[PDB]
């Protein structure tokens, strides 16, 4: 039967028993480090073998069976029966050992004792293989086309021809035709020749390009022929026999100074990533059991670590057909619970029909998707005297993201900044041996500090990241208490105070003790400090009473509490996901409130491409979320929908000059033309006046939605798009 998987997110602090938390942290850290080293060592082996002999059989080694051996080579365990090893396993182990010692010295790494590491290796190597295959399938064709264009020197030839024809005073269309029939057509011929594996017609490429093409084609077998006479199709159809060639392609790109791309996937994030916790993994590593756990006890073991009666683990879906099957994905802070229904034992409005189009009368909502204003929505019944308008901007969605970004920017220790700047001198996506080895050494030089900083949530931390730092409590206008930037609690009886500015020494020296006492009782603060530090902190607080004027106690307490300034990055990501979900639900609720429960959504056809100097925009995900909530969503073209005046169909223009909207660019370009404000050239468009020259002013989104309404009405009345918007 059909299979579906539903994932539910939660936190370790909620479902995980305190008794078995540290083992989970240790397992997560070890697994993440081993996976990162597995990626690095796999790329190291591939580049070492391909950099010495090009006859190496690299295509057949991209499989989970080899990645598993690579992963296990990084773990120390008691040796088994070697004579029972599989034939391929022996070759994989020999190849790994050929470079194991060199890689350990390069990365300054030692094997980590981890018994029962087979399942973890399998789970991580499956993802490694998936990443390799997906990356190749995705980008092989595009990178091949880029290399083909570079080989023919398309840009250079185009520029040379254009600059030669300029001296002859040729016309624009003549230049375009000459470029088309002198550059583009031979380039397409070369494209076809390379696609069908046959060399192009003589003279289309120089000797160097011919040699490079010969080298590229030598990667494939002599008798091997691309299926359906298309390399771009054979890559998807039979990826297995292309990986080696892909590498060569990447090399050729670096031969032309093209921007490097990650041919070999690598894990570079220092924050621990999610790992799959299985029943066997839980039994062996977390429960520390030393005997086989069969399916009969499968759930009972889970009952000894987490509670299965909570909402998170309860059955879900229609008729409760989805059940938890003892598989989790956790990184020590966030937890993903998977539920499956089977055993684990191996349109456009212009193209709508009359019946569908005419049932939306009085329910259509016209949306103009912008960049800063994500959704400008207007209803059909909107009038000048009744504004049924809604605005959903980028600030509302980016509140939490910007807050977290500013927190990271301000709280980043200088040492981490220096480490990142130093590591910036070594590219990772390069396929050259020298650069990869240099990056390995550079990463080894700063891994300790980077992991300690980013693993502060669960890893042991001793480094002092904030030397010569003094912390003083502050209270904002809302009576919220902050240490430096860490929220403590809201004081509801703070305003009542004596006359303004009681600057006596005793008050300002003793309020610190009161604020410290208030802070220490907070759960989210106490849980972050162990008894060893808490006892000393309380002892110093006691001494502060005797001598408030002394500053040494404050410095000592600040040094002790410096741990609180580190950020929970994983929990920040979890909160970001929750904030995104909350924003989606808030938008749905606002749409259902302002417009109606059964409102029909009309959205612009803008693709919202990622453009330089602007933040990423959510367009496809927005439509998917809207449809998932039951809103009928239909696309309407935006052709000439913002360059005409709805009042009289006259053209619009930009006139207002405003300082640069972005403050940081004001010092460079002080003023720019307003983009969201337009005016109608037709003077008579505005109501009667004593020749004062006033002209109607429009917000571009409002004009766009009005033109959308015009188009919808024209389609309803005639079923054809209005001529002005053809």
């Amino acid at each position: 039967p059909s299979k579906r998987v539903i994932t539910i997110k939660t936190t370790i602090k909620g479902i995980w028993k305190y008794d078995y938390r540290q083992p989970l942290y240790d397992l997560v850290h070890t697994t993440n480090l081993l996976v990162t080293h597995t990626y690095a060592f796999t790329k190291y082996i591939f580049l070492k073998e391909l950099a010495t002999d090009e006859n190496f059989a690299f295509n057949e080694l991209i499989t989970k069976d080899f990645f598993v051996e690579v992963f296990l080579s990084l773990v120390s365990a008691k040796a088994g029966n070697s004579e029972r090893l599989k034939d391929t396993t022996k070759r994989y182990r020999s190849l790994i050992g050929k470079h194991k010692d060199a890689y350990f010295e390069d990365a300054k790494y030692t094997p980590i004792s981890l018994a029962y590491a087979q399942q973890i290796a399998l789970y991580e190597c499956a993802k490694v293989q998936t990443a390799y295959f997906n990356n190749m399938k995705a980008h092989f064709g595009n990178r091949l086309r880029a290399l083909i264009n570079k080989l023919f020197k398309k840009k250079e030839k185009v520029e040379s021809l254009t600059k030669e024809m300029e001296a002859n005073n040729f016309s624009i269309k003549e230049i375009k035709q000459a470029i088309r029939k002198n550059v583009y057509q031979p380039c397409n011929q070369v494209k076809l020749a390379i696609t069908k594996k046959n060399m192009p017609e003589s003279g289309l490429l120089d000797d160097k390009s011919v040699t490079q093409l010969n080298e590229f084609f030598s990667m494939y077998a002599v008798d091997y022929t691309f299926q359906k006479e298309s390399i771009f199709y054979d890559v998807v159809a039979n990826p297995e026999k292309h990986f080696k060639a892909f590498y060569k392609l990447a090399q050729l790109s670096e031969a032309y100074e093209v921007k490097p791309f990650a041919c070999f996937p690598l894990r570079r994030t220092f924050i621990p990533c999610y790992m799959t916790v299985d029943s066997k993994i839980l039994n062996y590593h977390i429960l520390k059991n030393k005997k086989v756990l069969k399916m009969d006890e499968k759930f009972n073991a889970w009952g000894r670590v987490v509670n299965l009666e909570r909402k998170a683990f309860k059955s879900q879906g229609c008729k409760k057909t989805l059940h938890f099957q003892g598989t989790l994905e956790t990184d020590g802070v966030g937890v993903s619970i998977l539920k499956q229904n089977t055993d684990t034992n191996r349109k456009y409005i212009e193209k709508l029909e009359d019946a569908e189009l005419k049932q939306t009368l009085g329910k259509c909502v016209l949306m103009d998707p912008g960049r800063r204003d994500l959704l400008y929505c207007m209803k059909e019944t909107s009038r000048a005297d009744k504004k049924e308008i809604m605005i959903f901007t980028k600030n509302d969605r980016s509140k939490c993201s910007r807050h977290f970004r500013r927190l990271r920017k301000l709280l980043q220790p200088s040492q981490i900044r220096e480490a990142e700047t130093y590591l910036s001198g070594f590219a990772t996506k390069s396929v050259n041996m020298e650069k990869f080895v240099e990056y390995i050494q550079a990463r080894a030089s700063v891994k300790d500090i980077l992991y300690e900083y980013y693993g502060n949530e669960t890893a042991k931390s001793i480094t002092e990241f904030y030397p010569e730092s003094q912390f003083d409590f502050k209270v904002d206008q809302k009576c919220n208490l902050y240490y430096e930037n860490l929220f403590v609690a809201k004081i509801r009886g703070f305003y009542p105070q004596p006359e303004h500015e009681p600057n006596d020494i005793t008050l300002k020296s003793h309020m610190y003790h009161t604020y410290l006492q208030i802070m220490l009782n907070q759960k989210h603060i106490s849980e972050r400090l162990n008894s060893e530090k808490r006892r000393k902190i309380e002892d110093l607080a006691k001494a502060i009473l005797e001598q408030p004027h002394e500053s040494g106690h404050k410095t000592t307490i600040s040094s002790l509490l410096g741990k609180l300034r580190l950020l929970p990055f994983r929990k920040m990501k979890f909160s970001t996901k929750l904030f995104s979900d909350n924003n989606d639900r808030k938008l749905v609720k606002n749409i259902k409130k302002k417009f109606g429960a059964d409102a029909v959504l009309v959205l612009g056809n803008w693709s919202a491409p990622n453009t330089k100097y602007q933040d990423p925009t959510r367009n496809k995900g927005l439509r998917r979320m809207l449809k998932k909530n039951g809103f009928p969503l239909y696309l309407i073209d935006e052709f000439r929908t913002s360059s005409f005046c709805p009042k009289c169909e006259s053209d619009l223009e930009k006139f207002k000059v405003i300082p640069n909207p972005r403050p940081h660019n004001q010092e460079k370009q002080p003023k720019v033309l307003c983009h969201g404000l337009l005016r109608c050239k037709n003077m008579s468009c505005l109501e009667q006046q004593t020749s004062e020259g006033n002209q109607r002013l429009w917000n571009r989104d409002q004009a766009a939605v009005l033109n959308f309404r015009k188009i919808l009405n024209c389609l309803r009345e005639t079923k054809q798009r209005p001529p002005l918007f053809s």
């Binding site: 809302k478 004081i491 509801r492 009886g493 703070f494 305003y495 006359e499 008050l507």
Partner: protein
């Protein structure tokens, strides 16, 4: 105008009683909330709530029955209720008013003024006056400090209405 009384104990030793008179006819809602908190009808009250801020010659404060450090306090109507009126002013000592973190942030915390506070007019609501036990109020105030920290733990052991 109903009256309410509290029993004050320092370090487990009773020290006196304070008798209050409420302006029910002037501020009905705040007076009703204070009476409910004093009588414990709503399942929660000032019983055991400490005086967490005593500033000598300035004020005594209390009413935090959820955290005991000024960060807690809830009213019968919910988290907070709007200010009712300002028909009374801080012109004489012994006045009992509500502490707040700004407009429309009234909760359960209350305070008693030992000296005139003309600068607090229009910022907080006055809804009671001390009718007896002002000597006990001064006795407790003598144990206060400028920062508000009390030299000993002072809590309300019993409360009642008359």
């Amino acid at each position: 105008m109903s009256q309410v009384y509290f029993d004050v104990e320092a370090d487990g030793q009773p020290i006196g009683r304070v008798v209050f008179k409420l302006y029910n006819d002037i501020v009905p809602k705040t007076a009703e909330n204070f009476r409910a908190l004093c009588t414990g009808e709503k399942g929660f009250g000032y019983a055991g709530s400490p005086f967490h801020r005593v500033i000598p010659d300035f004020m005594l404060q209390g009413g935090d029955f959820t955290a005991g450090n000024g960060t807690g306090g809830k009213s019968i109507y919910g988290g907070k209720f709007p200010d009712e009126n300002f028909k009374k002013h801080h012109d004489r000592p012994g006045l009992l008013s509500m502490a707040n973190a700004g407009p429309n942030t009234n909760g359960s915390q209350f305070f008693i003024t030992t000296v005139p506070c003309p600068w607090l007019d229009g910022k907080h609501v006055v809804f009671g006056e001390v009718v007896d036990g002002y000597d006990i109020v001064k006795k407790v105030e003598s144990l206060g400090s400028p920062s508000g920290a009390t030299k000993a733990r002072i809590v309300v052991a019993k409360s009642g209405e008359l």
